[PDB]
Amino acid sequence: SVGGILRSTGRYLVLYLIIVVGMAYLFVRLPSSFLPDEDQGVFMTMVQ
Amino acid sequence: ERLSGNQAPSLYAISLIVVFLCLAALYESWSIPFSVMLVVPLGVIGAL
Amino acid sequence: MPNFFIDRPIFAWVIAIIIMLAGGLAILKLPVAQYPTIAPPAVTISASY
Amino acid sequence: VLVALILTPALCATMLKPIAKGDHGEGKKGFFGWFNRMFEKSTHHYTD
Ligand SMILES: CCCCCCCCCCCCO[C@@H]1O[C@H](CO)[C@@H](O[C@H]2O[C@H](CO)[C@@H](O)[C@H](O)[C@H]2O)[C@H](O)[C@H]1O
Ligand SMILES: CCCCCCCCCCCCO[C@@H]1O[C@H](CO)[C@@H](O[C@H]2O[C@H](CO)[C@@H](O)[C@H](O)[C@H]2O)[C@H](O)[C@H]1O
Ligand SMILES: CCCCCCCCCCCCO[C@@H]1O[C@H](CO)[C@@H](O[C@H]2O[C@H](CO)[C@@H](O)[C@H](O)[C@H]2O)[C@H](O)[C@H]1O
Ligand SMILES: CCCCCCCCCCCC
Ligand SMILES: CCCCCCCC
């Protein structure tokens, strides 16, 4: 199977650039944060 | 928030350079390190 | 070691560039002054009557 | 000393021009030709 892929060569370079454009799209779409808020089994309530 | 920010692209840029250089020393080739470094998007795409 | 890097000039160049890169990054974040701390420290007690 | 044991020999092996047997820069043209003749002459004076 790999032997057949090396005869193509240029066809998989185009498929690679699809993966990189897909990677680039998903990276900009995915919104960032620092650390998740965990359920620590306790919380508080302010009364003002 | 005001004391610095968005410093990861600077540190990852040099990280790519030092990985290129280490690979270049391993194989004794300026060209061959690119064959390793082109696999970086293959991991990132699945994570995203 | 000399013989090693004669046949491997890229390895030799890599070590140099990593030393130069690390030095370049140092110059950005290093403090700047006329001198270092060279005066001995002093503590003063002040009082009023 | 680390540069002189690692880098310097690697450059001498690759980026130095060949010098034929006998040539001590005495047949150079201009100021350098004068300097090499003067210096080779001064080396003889010095050794004696
Ligand atoms: C076994 C290999 C060890 C090789 C040691 C020689 C290389 C020295 C490290 C690389 C030098 C360049 O990188 C330099 O590193 C020093 C580390 O003290 C950083 O200095 C740092 O000090 C402390 C941590 O100790 C941090 O809180 C501070 O934010 C930072 O300034 C410089 O900001 C950086 O510019
Ligand atoms: C091969 C020749 C070697 C010649 C060596 C001569 C070096 C002399 C350096 C002394 C002066 C250094 O002065 C130092 O400059 C760097 C930028 O370059 C500044 O750096 C500052 O600006 C840059 C942007 O320009 C920021 O990315 C950085 O976060 C900030 O700290 C330092 O705040 C300053 O203190
Ligand atoms: C004590 C004070 C220092 C001395 C200053 C007064 C000079 C006294 C003579 C000492 C020698 C001076 O060094 C001077 O260098 C020039 C370099 O161009 C030499 O000239 C040399 O280069 C030219 C340029 O193509 C050639 O054509 C020539 O064949 C060659 O000799 C002079 O021959 C020499 O007179
Ligand atoms: C033996 C290889 C000859 C080419 C030398 C490359 C020089 C790289 C200079 C890097 C400057 C930071
Ligand atoms: C005499 C052989 C020493 C080889 C050392 C090479 C490691 C850089």
Q: Would you mind describing this structure in some detail?
A:
The structure is cut from a larger assembly and holds 4 copies of chain A. The relative contact order of chain A is 0.07. Chain A contains 2 helices and no strands. Chain A is rod-shaped. Chain A has helices at residues 2-8, 10-29. Helices cover 56% and strands 0% of the residues of chain A. With 48 residues, chain A is mainly alpha-helical. The longest helix of chain A has 20 residues, at 10-29. The C-D interface holds C 1-2, 5-9, 12-13, 15-16 and D 3, 5-7, 9-11, 13-14. The complex binds dodecyl-beta-D-maltoside (3 copies), dodecane and N-octane (OCT). Chain A: Belongs to the resistance-nodulation-cell division (RND) (TC 2.A.6) family.
SSE layout:
This is part of a larger assembly, with four copies of chain A.
Chain A lengths: L1 H7 L1 H20 L19
The complex binds dodecyl-beta-D-maltoside (3 copies), dodecane (D12) and N-octane.
Function (chain C): AcrA-AcrB-AcrZ-TolC is a drug efflux protein complex with broad substrate specificity that uses the proton motive force to export substrates.
Subunit structure (chain C): Homotrimer, with large domains that extend into the periplasm, interacts with AcrA and TolC. AcrA may be required to stably link this protein and TolC. Interacts with AcrZ. Part of the AcrA-AcrB-AcrZ-TolC efflux pump.
Protein name (chain C): Multidrug efflux pump subunit AcrB
